[PDB]
Amino acid sequence: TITYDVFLSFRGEDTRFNFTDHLYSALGRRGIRTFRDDKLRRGEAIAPELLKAIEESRSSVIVFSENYARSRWCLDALVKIMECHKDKKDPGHAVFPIFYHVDPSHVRKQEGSFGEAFAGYGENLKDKIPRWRTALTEAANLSGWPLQDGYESNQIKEITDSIFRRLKCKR
């Protein structure tokens, strides 16, 4: 079953109210139905509604940001997104990564200030760190958009145009 065209994965502390919100609106203007979580959530494990939303999405757009790996919920959602890209067919789950002011290699290799996040995870999350690294490394190896300082409105326009074209070709 399919409900959304795009599941928007992002680190709220970094881009909730600014870049990802403008990206969310641009996707809507193109007729791309997008799930952008805005609910208050608490607890240890990721909310099941988010995992369910990923399963019912034709694709996921990941807004990688400096502190993305500092949130277990973002990493857990990424693991689900990549398990979906690999295992799901009819329809497939496309994955569009956006490196928002982060070096793509910092995400792929878990290096730089982006990689420092894994020092804060202890042995309570030993079993998780390998699937987290693998999901990050895999996601960073899909054709995306490295975004450095620049006119964001144009960056988002090119990104959502390319996603609109790719999703229409997948249908």
Strand partners, 10: 63
Please say whether the dihedral angle defined by the alpha carbons of residues 117, 123, 128 and 130, taken in this order, is positive or negative.
Answer: positive
Q: Is residue 84 within 8 Å of residue 60, measured between CB atoms? A: yes
Query: Nearest residue by C-beta to ligand NAD?
Result: 104
Does position 94 interact with ligand NAD (CB under 6 A)? The reply is: no
Helix (H, G, I), strand (E, B) or coil at 77: helix
Contact pattern from residue 123 through residue 162 relative to ligand NAD, giving x for each residue in contact according to CB under 6 A and a dash for the rest = -----------------xxxxx-x----------------
Diameter of the chain by CA atoms?
45
Size of the site for ligand NAD (CB under 6 A): 9
Q: Which is nearer to ligand NAD, 67 or 105 (CB)?
A: 105
Whole-angstrom CA distances from 156 to 53, 86, 114, 126, 152 are 23, 26, 23, 37, 6
Does position 115 interact with ligand NAD (CB under 6 A)? The reply is: no
Distance CA 15, CA 10 (A): 7
Does position 25 interact with ligand NAD (CB under 6 A)? The reply is: no
The nearest distance, CB 39 to ligand NAD, in angstroms, is 30
Q: Which of residues 44-73 bind ligand NAD (CB under 6 A)?
A: none
Q: Which residues bind ligand NAD (CB under 6 A)?
A: 97, 104-105, 140-144, 146
